[PDB]
């Protein structure tokens, strides 16, 4: 999962580098019940 940080931890605090990856889903290779609907909306 490629991500380039934009903020500076000195003022932003921690957490940006690993942002948006959920411990109980992405990090466990598990999908929630409706995210497939979102991914399917990108098909055109």
């Amino acid at each position: 999962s490629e991500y380039q940080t934009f903020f500076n931890p000195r003022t932003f605090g921690s957490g940006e580098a690993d942002c948006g990856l959920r411990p109980l889903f992405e990090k466990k290779s598990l999908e929630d019940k409706t995210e497939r609907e979102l991914l399917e909306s990108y098909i055109d």
Binding site: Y3, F7, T11, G15, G20, L24, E26, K33, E37
Partner: protein, 253 residues
């Protein structure tokens, strides 16, 4: 949230609940973007005509929650606020343009399986994801219907982004580029919308390019909830990113 469903545990770990105090009650939704910063809507905190002006000392935030009313031991965290920053050009007199506020936690919150920050979009991700037809997700503990009808647990609803011309024709209010609208069209056969109590919450989208969740918007205003031919409006997070950066740089340390 109208026509949504119960969120799964840890499904929205960046979800933040904003409260007022003495008496303490749900005020709005909000989102965690780091262990010291939280995003919400300006109208959750300030509205001169009603003498509404919630400051750090009048608020508190609960993080890592699922239940709307039950305290969740060793899971939820309560964080006081050090300071709040509302966009100086938040247009409360007309259309709630730039409906955004940043809140700095008095003490950093520890991450867990239930508390984790959401990403803010870079230019490419915003251009790639914030497009008409693509669906994003809104979460909150607000009312289930326009007209006490409150959910037992965090609600979630997926909604499609709407073309700007359609958003504009749907309301008499002057829409700006710092706003976008979302929701299903009368002919799409499905429903859903944010409602009273959901303001300040996040409108997120999952990037298929890096599998990460990005907060594209902040639940802002609407006209009623889930009405035919109407759409909910959201603060365009990317367009206000320069302001976010400025505020964080000036007050973050």
């Amino acid at each position: 949230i109208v026509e949504g469903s119960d969120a799964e545990i840890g499904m929205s770990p960046w979800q933040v609940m904003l409260f007022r105090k003495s008496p303490q009650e749900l005020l709005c939704g909000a989102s965690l973007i780091s262990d010291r910063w939280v995003l919400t809507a300006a109208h959750c905190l300030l509205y001169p005509p009603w003498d509404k002006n919630f400051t750090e000392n009048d608020l508190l935030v609960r993080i890592g929650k699922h239940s709307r009313t039950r305290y969740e031991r060793n899971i939820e965290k309560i964080s006081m606020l050090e300071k709040i920053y509302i966009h100086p050009r938040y247009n409360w007199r007309e259309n709630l343009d730039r409906d955004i506020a940043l809140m700095k936690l008095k003490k950093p919150v520890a991450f867990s399986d239930y508390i984790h920050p959401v990403c803010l979009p870079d230019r490419e991700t915003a251009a790639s994801l914030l497009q008409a037809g693509y669906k994003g997700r809104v979460t909150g503990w607000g009312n289930l219907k326009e007209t006490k009808g409150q959910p037992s647990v965090l609600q979630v609803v997926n909604l499609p982004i709407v073309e700007r011309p359609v958003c504009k024709d749907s309301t008499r209010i002057r829409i700006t580029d710092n706003m976008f609208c979302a929701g299903y069209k009368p002919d799409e056969g499905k429903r859903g919308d944010a409602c009273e109590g959901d303001a300040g919450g996040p409108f997120v989208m999952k990037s298929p390019f890096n599998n990460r969740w990005y907060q594209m918007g902040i639940v802002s205003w609407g006209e009623g909830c889930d009405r035919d031919g109407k759409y909910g409006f959201y603060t365009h997070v990317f367009r206000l990113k320069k302001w976010i950066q400025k505020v964080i740089d000036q007050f973050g340390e």
